[PDB]
Amino acid sequence: QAQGVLASQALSQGSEPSSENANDTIILRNLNPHSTMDSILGALAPYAVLSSSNVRVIKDKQTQLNRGFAFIQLSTIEAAQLLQILQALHPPLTIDGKTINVEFAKGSKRDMASNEGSRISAASVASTAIA
């Protein structure tokens, strides 16, 4: 029994600009080598309109298991509003007692634009001999 132990919350911020390429992408932490995509998809189910395109999970090199993090791509404003929601929730997919943090792996902003250019890569094609 205790009923006499309480703590406070705190925050931090602080970033400087870098790169060109960024996209407002949420990042997961606290995860385990065995965690599934499911935990993330289940958490965001009623709070997003996304799928397993958005939810991605880089593995380790020494193993073929996870690296304790994962990714979610979002719209700019939506990334910067979803984050605050996620500070209060966790999915039922608690493998190995693993609840799910929230953090924000953005960088730069965006603006509206377009592009144009070619996309070709070739050299030659030869794949036989004779004898």
**CATH number, position 111:** 3.30.70.330
Q: How was this structure determined?
A: NMR
With H, G, I as helix, E, B as strand and everything else as coil, classify residue 30.
Answer: coil
Structural domain boundaries enclosing 94? 1-131
- Cβ pair 8, 78 in contact under 8 A: no
d(CA 26, CA 53): 14
Q: Using CB atoms within 10 Å of the CB of residue 55, give its burial: 0 to 12 exposed, 13 to 18 middle, 19+ buried.
A: buried
What is the residue whose two structure tokens read 């953090």? 103
Domains: count for the chain? 1
